[model samples]
Target chain A: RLLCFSIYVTKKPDQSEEDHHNHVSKVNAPMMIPFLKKYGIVRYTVKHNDAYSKPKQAALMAGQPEENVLAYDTVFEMIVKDIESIQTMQKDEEFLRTAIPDLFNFADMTRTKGSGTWIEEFTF
Target chain B: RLLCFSIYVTKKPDQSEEDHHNHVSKVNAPMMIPFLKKYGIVRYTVKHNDAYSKPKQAALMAGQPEENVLAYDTVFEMIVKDIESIQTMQKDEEFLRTAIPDLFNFADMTRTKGSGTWIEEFTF
Candidate 1:
């Protein structure tokens, strides 16, 4: 069984969804790439306000099951910060400071946990 | 690109880690199983204070990379609430109340968002 830690980032209350996406792709995502790759964070996903039903689409498209999905006016970045016993925060914080320096200015991060078991495939 | 919403569940602040795990595995996990299966929640993980580094272990064991792994004195459940625009919360809340009745008595849920894209395989 494996464990995981998640960090959920979202646009500030005042940031527009368009500007937020632009900023993420143009600025934040790029800066976090090196850090993510350096740490082998291949497990992650993204969601936006427009495609609030994306997860359901995935289930239907892949013939998987359906689950609860929350929508936000703000675009969010749900990153898999830890995979299986990997210390990965200090470096992330350091990178944020070096890259954005004002990360909180555009977005905020909410840390959470997972099921402890990593599923490799989705089946009935 | 796919979108995702995350629901993070954690043990009550005052609860002991051991008891927390026991309750999750024995009580909560069972009740949630049907709901998860019904929703096709194949993407999820768990974490505890002991294996705060489990994600890193998964990476190393799979010959992957390392990342920030938050440690919790409390055991946490990170459930992928949505994969692609899945309207799964109202049903989930209904199910929770019917099944656990006193869910918040033992744990709390923190919802978050993702990258809007689902990665099939974890690679560099």
Candidate 2:
């Protein structure tokens, strides 16, 4: 079975609008895919929005159910055998500039990160 | 201020190639973006691979650092204000067939799910 690793990207509280735009565009650019294709990335998917808040306002605008509006935005997940390949991507000048967060690798088995807290392993 | 929510998709052990392909394609289809634009999805990004293992084999093939091979596949993240909009996406007949996982909403403050376990709130 394959193990899982997740990397989250978002705007820093102090980050400026132009800076945030550049960050998102660089990381999401089409060029990144050819870069990943060399690796064994089995899947790639993108969505917008990533936070949690009341659905009331958006519901009013969309005329959908409050339950339906309970969605958040922008997360990138990849499935592969090797986890360290990300470190290479992380080291790339472009990806590094984006400042992607630390790699969180989850597997079928469980372990801890030396923080004394056990990591949650998501199983299929 | 946008809130974030993440939805994870992966292949079930029992899932077949045809079925998995259909699932991934349907969810990752270009058509879905227009569907989401109605909502406030500000960004969309896709990556391949999703599990954790040694970079040794892949590194041997790529001739890169073992640390560089540490990447995984396929995660979809969105940035938006409303969290429930995902429920609408989930309810779509096509999206429903894909069987996307339950929405995981992370926010600025902390809370618990009554499982007596507190949810980890990811902050920027």
Candidate 3:
């Protein structure tokens, strides 16, 4: 006999890590699929992106009340990468640009003082 | 009969101080109009802004998500004052051309700081 597996993904900053871990633990829970793996069942995670990445991606795929992937990515990118990129430009230019532009202004000065980009240098 | 002087505005903010003083008082709330302007209608607003010159310019305009005349003049400027802009073509050229080409690279025994353009005084 053969069996198939289905997976679900979600992302929310408001959700605690305990619940997140619990959800992952449950997916692998039964411990014995009754006919599939070396243990009994097969397991697969549809979303493997890190902290803020996977959840947002999952939401986009959820369909009905699932996810607003665009909205999630829009917020996360604004918070992390996009702001960092602008900081690079400001750093490469090395000026406070006559005004306190936004939070991006501060992040640039902080990141530029160091070597290597966090996303590129460190793998999560 | 005298029966008019009503207004309504949408509220937005995660949290605020000015709101507590101007809004939370029981003696001062119909939280409506008249029966509001006498001893019963008196209000105390202790927080405001400078550039906006009033509190109504909250974000940009009113019921316009309503930022009052006293709003933060935060706008992305497309134009600027003075083409008398200073550009340090040399130090930057070096940083780009030969300096730490990657995170792994080091500044070859020399470090130079640029000045006189980004901000008039090094101290803010």
Quantify all predictions' global Cα lDDT against the true fold.
0.45, 0.37, 0.22
Between prediction 1 and prediction 3, which has the larger DockQ?
A: 1
lDDT value, residue A18 of candidate 1 = 71
lDDT of 2 by residue, B1-124 (tens): 5443433334444545455434444544454565466554554433233222233334332543344332222334454445556557646776554333311111111111100000121111
**lDDT tens per residue, model 2, A10-53:** 44445554554444445444545754665555544332332122
Top lDDT: which candidate number? 1
Question: After aligning candidate 2 to the native by TM-score, how far in Å is the CA of B3 from where it should be?
Answer: 2.5
Listed in order, each prediction's TM-score against the native is: 0.48, 0.33, 0.16
DockQ of each: 0.13, 0.06, 0.01
Docking class for model 3 is incorrect
Give the per-residue lDDT digits (tens) of candidate 1, residues A58-122: 54334222333323333322234344223453346676476556566566544221223332222
Error of 3 at A24 (Å): 1.8
How big an interface RMSD has model 3?
Answer: 28.2
State the weakest 10-residue window (summed lDDT) of model 3 chain A: A115-124
The interface root-mean-square deviations, each candidate in sequence, come to: 8.1, 14.0, 28.2
In model 3 chain B, which range of ten residues has the least summed lDDT? B115-124
Once model 3 is optimally superposed onto the true structure by TM-score, how far is the C-alpha of residue B38 displaced, in angstroms? 78
**Candidate 3 per-residue lDDT over residues B69-90, each given as its tens digit:** 2122111001112211111211
